[PDB]
Design a protein around this ligand. Structure first.
Ligand SMILES: CC(=O)NCCc1cccc(-c2cccc(C(=O)O)c2)c1
Length: 242
């Protein structure tokens, strides 16, 4: 069962923005969104792909564990935090594309393709360059499809080891306090129109979990903070977080 709540559009309108928020209540098995159509429109996953990419790299042994150091290749890039060593935790925290490009190269087209199909991940199409297809290739995923994937991850139901899923869920840790835990991943798609920002993950409460997946128009990097800000305003409105 799905319910459309156009009142959430105000949270996008307030910022001269457009986008979709999709919530899934795990206890009630009920979904909520401001825009049923855009909830089912498929976009490039951009850095939200680091979730499946991490899972595959861990399960194949490309990544030993969350402590393995991936040394900076010495090439100065424009994102300062990319010009340093990383492990899986920090590489996910700072969306370090070059680290995950090497993961994908070592995974390879064939194993990457099989795994995304095993994950039922988006359109499961890796057409393009193996080290950038999630940024400018043929792979696409919708907000509702992000949730279906994330629900499997949360329940350790993806076709990789429990350990791989636990590790990636650790790497997804974004925020935690006495009221909730957020495990999520941001995304920023600029290479193919329309330019969008992603934020997908879930909110762990004492006796329920709310999965979420949002994307929004992102003409400039100046609005990237709106991904979390808008999502949280929706969560506050639905009394999911204080
Ligand atoms: C230098 C600097 O901080 N520029 C402003 C911030 C910026 C510029 C260009 C690309 C990204 C980026 C790249 C991959 C993933 C993500 C994400 O938010 O998931 C974001 C961020």
């Amino acid at each position: 069962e799905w319910q459309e709540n156009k009142s959430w559009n105000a949270h996008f309108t307030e910022h001269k923005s457009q986008g979709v928020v999709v919530l899934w209540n795990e206890n009630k098995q009920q979904g909520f969104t401001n825009n049923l159509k855009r909830a089912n429109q498929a976009f490039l996953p951009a850095s939200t792909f680091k979730i499946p990419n991490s899972l595959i790299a861990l399960d194949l042994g490309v990544v030993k564990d969350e402590h393995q150091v991936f040394k900076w290749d010495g090439q100065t890039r424009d994102i300062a935090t990319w010009n340093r060593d990383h492990n899986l935790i920090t590489a996910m925290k700072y969306s370090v594309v070059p680290v995950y490009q090497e993961f994908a190269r070592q995974i390879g087209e064939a194993r990457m393709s099989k795994m995304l199909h095993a994950f039922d991940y988006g359109n499961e199409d890796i057409s393009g360059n193996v080290d950038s297809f999630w940024l400018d290739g043929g792979i696409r995923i919708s907000a509702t499809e992000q949730i279906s994937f994330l629900r499997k991850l949360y329940h350790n139901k993806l076709h990789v080891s429990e350990r791989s899923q636990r590790i990636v869920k650790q790497a997804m840790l974004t925020e935690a306090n006495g009221d909730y835990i957020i495990r999520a991943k941001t995304g920023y798609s600029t290479r193919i129109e329309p330019k969008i920002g992603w934020w997908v993950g879930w909110v762990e409460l004492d006796d329920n979990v709310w999965f979420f997946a949002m994307n929004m128009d992102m003409p400039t990097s100046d609005g990237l903070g709106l991904r979390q800000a808008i999502t949280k305003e929706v969560l506050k409105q639905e009394k999911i977080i204080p």
